[PDB]
């Protein structure tokens, strides 16, 4: 009544902003993307950029397990 509250699902904690949530796991989430000849690994914290594979013919799609 007169306001709203924001809730983060299990595995997430809520920032002082109230509107935003952060993830509880210690392992850094990272991005994987592929060009024609490369598969690259980039970290969302921006600290790291690395190579997964090179010389492939045409890497058009990726998925993980």
């Amino acid at each position: 009544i007169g306001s709203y509250i924001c809730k983060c699902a299990p595995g997430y904690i809520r920032e002082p902003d109230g509107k935003s949530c952060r993830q509880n796991s210690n392992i850094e989430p990272y991005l994987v993307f592929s060009n024609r000849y490369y598969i690259r690994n980039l970290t969302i914290d921006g600290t790291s950029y690395s190579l997964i594979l090179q010389g492939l013919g045409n890497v058009v799609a990726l998925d993980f397990d």
Partner: peptide, 11 residues
């Protein structure tokens, strides 16, 4: 989590 405190963003 403990690691979060000095990470550089006000948690």
């Amino acid at each position: 989590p403990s690691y979060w405190f000095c990470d550089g963003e006000a948690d």
